[PDB]
Amino acid sequence: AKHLKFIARTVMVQEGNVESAYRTLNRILTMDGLIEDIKHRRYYEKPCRRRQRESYERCRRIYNMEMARKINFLMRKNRADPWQGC
Amino acid sequence: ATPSLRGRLARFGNPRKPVLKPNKPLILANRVGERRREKGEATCITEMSVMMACWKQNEFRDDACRKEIQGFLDCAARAQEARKMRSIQETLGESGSLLPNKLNKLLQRFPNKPYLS
Amino acid sequence: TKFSIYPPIPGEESSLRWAGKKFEEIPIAHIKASHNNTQIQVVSASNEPLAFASCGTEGFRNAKKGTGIAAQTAGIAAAARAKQKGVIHIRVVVKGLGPGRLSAMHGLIMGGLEVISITDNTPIPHXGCRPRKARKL
Amino acid sequence: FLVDFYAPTAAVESMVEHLSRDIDVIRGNIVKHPLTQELKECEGIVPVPLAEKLYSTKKR
Amino acid sequence: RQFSYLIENMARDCGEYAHTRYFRGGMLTNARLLFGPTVRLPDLIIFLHTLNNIFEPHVAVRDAAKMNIPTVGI
Amino acid sequence: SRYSPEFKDPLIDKEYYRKPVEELTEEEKYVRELKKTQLIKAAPAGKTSSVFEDPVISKFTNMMMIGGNKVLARSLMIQTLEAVKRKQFEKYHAASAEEQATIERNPYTIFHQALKNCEPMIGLVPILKGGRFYQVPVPLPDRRRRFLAMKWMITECRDKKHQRTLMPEKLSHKLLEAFHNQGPVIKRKHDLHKMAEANRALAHYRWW
RNA sequence: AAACUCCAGUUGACACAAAAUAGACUACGAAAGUGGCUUUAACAUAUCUGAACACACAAUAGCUAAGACCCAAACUGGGAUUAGAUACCCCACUAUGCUUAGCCCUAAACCUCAACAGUUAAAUCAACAAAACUGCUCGCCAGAACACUACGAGCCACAGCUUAAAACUCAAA
Numbered sequence: 017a018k019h020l021k022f023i024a025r026t027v028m029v030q031e032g033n034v035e036s037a038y039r040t041l042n043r044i045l046t047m048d049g050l051i052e053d054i055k056h057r058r059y060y061e062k063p064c065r066r067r068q069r070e071s072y073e074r075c076r077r078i079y080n081m082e083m084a085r086k087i088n089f090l091m092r093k094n095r096a097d098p099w100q101g102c
Numbered sequence: 103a104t105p106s107l108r109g110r111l112a113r114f115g116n117p118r119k120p121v122l123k124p125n126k127p128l129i130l131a132n133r134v135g136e137r138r139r140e141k142g143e144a145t146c147i148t149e150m151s152v153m154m155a156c157w158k159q160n161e162f163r164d165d166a167c168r169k170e171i172q173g174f175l176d177c178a179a180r181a182q183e184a185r186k187m188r189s190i191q192e193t194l195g196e197s198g199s200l201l202p203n204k205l206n207k208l209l210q211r212f213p214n215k216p217y218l219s
Numbered sequence: 220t221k222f223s224i225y226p227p228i229p230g231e232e233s234s235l236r237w238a239g240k241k242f243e244e245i246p247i248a249h250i251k252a253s254h255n256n257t258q259i260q261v262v263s264a265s266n267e268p269l270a271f272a273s274c275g276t277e278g279f280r281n282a283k284k285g286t287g288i289a290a291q292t293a294g295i296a297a298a299a300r301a302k303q304k305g306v307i308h309i310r311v312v313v314k315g316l317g318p319g320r321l322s323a324m325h326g327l328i329m330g331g332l333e334v335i336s337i338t339d340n341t342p343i344p345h346x347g348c349r350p351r352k353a354r355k356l
Numbered sequence: 357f358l359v360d361f362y363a364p365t366a367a368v369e370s371m372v373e374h375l376s377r378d379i380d381v382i383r384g385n386i387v388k389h390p391l392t393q394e395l396k397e398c399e400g401i402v403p404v405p406l407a408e409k410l411y412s413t414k415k416r
Numbered sequence: 417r418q419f420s421y422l423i424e425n426m427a428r429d430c431g432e433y434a435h436t437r438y439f440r441g442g443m444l445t446n447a448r449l450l451f452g453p454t455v456r457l458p459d460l461i462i463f464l465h466t467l468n469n470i471f472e473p474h475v476a477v478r479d480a481a482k483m484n485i486p487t488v489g490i
Numbered sequence: 491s492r493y494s495p496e497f498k499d500p501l502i503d504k505e506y507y508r509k510p511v512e513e514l515t516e517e518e519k520y521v522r523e524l525k526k527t528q529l530i531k532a533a534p535a536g537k538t539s540s541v542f543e544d545p546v547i548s549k550f551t552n553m554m555m556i557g558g559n560k561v562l563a564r565s566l567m568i569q570t571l572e573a574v575k576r577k578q579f580e581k582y583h584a585a586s587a588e589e590q591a592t593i594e595r596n597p598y599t600i601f602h603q604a605l606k607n608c609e610p611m612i613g614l615v616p617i618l619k620g621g622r623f624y625q626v627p628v629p630l631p632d633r634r635r636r637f638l639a640m641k642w643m644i645t646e647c648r649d650k651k652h653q654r655t656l657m658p659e660k661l662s663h664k665l666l667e668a669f670h671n672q673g674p675v676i677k678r679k680h681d682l683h684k685m686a687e688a689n690r691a692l693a694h695y696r697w698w
Numbered sequence: 699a700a701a702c703u704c705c706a707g708u709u710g711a712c713a714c715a716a717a718a719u720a721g722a723c724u725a726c727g728a729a730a731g732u733g734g735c736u737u738u739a740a741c742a743u744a745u746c747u748g749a750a751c752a753c754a755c756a757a758u759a760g761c762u763a764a765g766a767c768c769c770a771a772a773c774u775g776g777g778a779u780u781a782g783a784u785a786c787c788c789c790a791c792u793a794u795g796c797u798u799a800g801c802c803c804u805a806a807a808c809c810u811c812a813a814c815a816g817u818u819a820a821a822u823c824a825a826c827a828a829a830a831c832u833g834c835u836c837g838c839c840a841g842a843a844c845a846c847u848a849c850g851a852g853c854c855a856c857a858g859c860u861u862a863a864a865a866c867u868c869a870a871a
């Protein structure tokens with residue numbers, strides 16, 4: 017209300033391709049976490065429930081990043097069998 | 103970089119209060135989650151809206167709305183063909199990430215061992 | 220020159236023009252996409268109302284309002300009344316994450332208006348009023 | 357503008373009240389001078405090993 | 417699997433036996449059922465690789481100890 | 491089915507097999523070569539290679555059949571076509587030279603166009619959401635559009651409103667009105683469109 | 699549906715309320731607690747353990763007295779659902795959540811895992827959970843239910859809290 021307008025979260029439409037600009041705006045909000053913040057703010061999340069959700073997400077992130085690292089680590093083994101028949 | 107797990111969990115050595123309370127042990131499994139099908143959405147709503155708009159203006163006469171009717175009819179043909187191709191060719195084509203069925207075969211070649219052998 | 224997604228600064232001098240009007244003088248099309256209804260108002264640079272439309276004012280009532288097609292109908296109507304007063308290019312300021320967030324913008328495009336900038340002005344308090352309690356669904 | 361000065365601790369509270377009544381001051385904040393604090397020398401970044409022995413080695 | 421071909425040829429040349437394939441359960445402990453009542457178990461087992469393809473001890477290592485068969489393993 | 495899955499549907503088209511070899515494409519040549527090694531089903535009695543064969547008319551005739559009485563079903567079809575042609579001929583001779591130009595006397599052209607005018611562009615599917623059924627507008631497949639046109643025509647002719655009126659007379663009368671964008675069958679299409687347009691805000695319920 | 703229509707949208711002015719992102723950080727405090735900014739004061743013990751006759755604290759809810767009004771919201775009212783709905787859904791609003799002063803002394807106050815000093819060797823080890831133990835001290839526990847109860851006693855507590863039984867009953871819990 018006291019900041020300059022048409023600067024924050026503003027995407028310029030290029031050559032009238034509104035579809036690309038809106039997806040760019042949507043992705044920027046998602047990456048900064050604004051989209052997920054708004055949804056959880058629709059109904060109040062009690063402090064006990066928020067900590068349980070945060071702990072679940074933090075544990076989820078650790079498992080997701082560790083499993084992703086192993087998949088990339090073992091991806092080089094996805095080649096064909098070099099000892100076929102043995 | 104993976105977030106550190108030193109002192110996060112409540113243990114015997116840890117003097118501080120726990121940071122994470124996982125309902126399951128933090129051990130990598132031998133399987134990944136199967137691919138989740140996309141939730142269905144209504145298609146050709148825009149073309150349907152345009153076609154139905156002219157009917158209100160032209161008293162539901164098809165002769166005066168031939169161009170808009172064909173536009174919606176063409177969209178349904180494309181949507182039906184794309185849906186069949188996406189469900190069959192794209193799923194079988196293995197486009198993008200590796201399929202979970204093939205990924206699980208690679209994972210079981212190098213199983214995670216949380217025990218001592 | 221290479222296209223810049225960042226809007227030009229009003230203080231600075233920029234060569235971008237739309238029908239001889241600078242970016243600061245373009246009329247603004249504010250969109251309020253709630254969970255149940257979509258309200259679209261087009262105003263000029265001098266905060267002069269030009270056109271207003273919503274799902275409730277375009278033959279949709281109750282649950283029918285909270286749909287994309289209802290928002291699209293309002294967008295077309297909002298463009299039609301704005302186009303009568305000489306509006307061609309608009310700056311879109313969408314507020315809310317309702318179902319008509321994008322469909323209402325489509326109605327403006329199909330109604331004869333041109334979109335040059337998209338801005339999201341969803342109110343996000345930084346700590347603010349405590350929202351209502353969770354639903355036991 | 358920046359004003360650097362040496363004042364007793366009790367002089368900080370009085371100055372804050374003074375600045376509020378001044379109509380020509382848009383905003384006035386009194387903070388410690390950042391040069392007074394000495395930045396401790398940093399050796400670098402020590403890699404954090406993956407946590408081990410978090411669970412028993414029993415065959416589940 | 418890389419040296420499976422070599423070990424089988426070496427066993428044939430020296431007139432001995434090789435098992436470089438998948439080890440079916442009970443080949444040693446339940447040999448009297450898989451082969452016959454009068455089968456003769458090996459008097460010595462040599463492991464050129466003591467680990468299976470999941471990096472765990474070979475099943476025959478534990479089985480040979482049960483059947484009091486000495487093992488020589490690399 | 492007594493036909494094994496290896497059997498293929500026969501192709502009844504004289505001009506298909508008379509096409510010169512040069513005009514055939516590589517894929518089209520492969521199809522002809524492949525069919526020489528595939529089992530072929532016997533040709534059904536309904537379909538023939540006669541130049542007078544009309545797939546739509548035979549399809550409509552089958553839908554009029556009751557208890558396998560195709561002889562009576564086809565008799566009602568041919569009498570309807572004869573009745574339509576006779577009615578148009580009477581109107582043609584009673585019309586002035588200028589009006590005679592726009593009068594159609596071909597029974598097949600009238601029959602085909604009349605069915606086309608009755609085809610609905612969109613349909614309604616009752617969707618169970620929230621413990622209630624809503625008539626959600628949906629696009630209709632090409633086969634469904636033509637089937638609805640024939641079923642609507644037959645149902646109106648079999649209605650009890652008509653008294654002591656033969657089927658060839660009822661069917662011929664409705665075909666002309668449909669060909670002129672009039673009658674109850676055409677009104678049925680508009681009523682379906684009006685309900686679909688009225689419930690257009692429920693078009694997001696469908697998940698396909 | 700009810701409610702609102704003294705309404706909604708754009709713009710400006712505009713807190714005694716609550717503190718996005720940082721935070722994938724794991725820090726501080728005895729615990730409870732602590733995550734907007736600045737300043738002041740300030741974070742006990744040169745051996746350890748140690749007071750449920752002591753003293754000082756103790757989330758939330760609640761009482762008492764005077765204020766603050768945005769939002770949320772017991773109870774209540776209205777709308778709906780239902781066989782009924784004193785509920786779940788919707789709306790409106792009060793106590794209350796905030797501040798000052800004095801109370802209340804409870805929690806799944808649970809990381810249900812005592813403080814200090816150690817060990818990873820043997821028999822490691824019922825199970826599961828968060829691997830198994832040594833030295834020392836304090837607190838606590840001895841079948842289930844009756845029983846976070848009765849009585850006695852203490853308490854700014856008076857529908858309360860703390861301490862805490864018995865008879866009858868069961869062969870299980």
Ligand SMILES: [K+]
Pocket residue numbers: 345346717734
């Ligand atoms: K904040």
Ligand SMILES: [Mg+2]
Pocket residue numbers: 017018
């Ligand atoms: Mg402000």
Ligand SMILES: [Mg+2]
Pocket residue numbers: 117118
């Ligand atoms: Mg600590």
Ligand SMILES: [Mg+2]
Pocket residue numbers: 125
């Ligand atoms: Mg658990």
Ligand SMILES: [Mg+2]
Pocket residue numbers: 135138
């Ligand atoms: Mg998944």
Ligand SMILES: [Mg+2]
Pocket residue numbers: none
């Ligand atoms: Mg009403």
Ligand SMILES: [Mg+2]
Pocket residue numbers: none
């Ligand atoms: Mg406002």
Ligand SMILES: [Mg+2]
Pocket residue numbers: none
């Ligand atoms: Mg506060």
Ligand SMILES: [Mg+2]
Pocket residue numbers: none
């Ligand atoms: Mg605070």
Ligand SMILES: [Mg+2]
Pocket residue numbers: 721
């Ligand atoms: Mg956070």
Ligand SMILES: [Mg+2]
Pocket residue numbers: none
């Ligand atoms: Mg501070």
Ligand SMILES: [Mg+2]
Pocket residue numbers: none
């Ligand atoms: Mg401070």
Ligand SMILES: [Mg+2]
Pocket residue numbers: none
């Ligand atoms: Mg200390």
Ligand SMILES: [Mg+2]
Pocket residue numbers: 748
């Ligand atoms: Mg002590």
Ligand SMILES: [Mg+2]
Pocket residue numbers: 756
């Ligand atoms: Mg308290």
Ligand SMILES: [Mg+2]
Pocket residue numbers: none
């Ligand atoms: Mg209180």
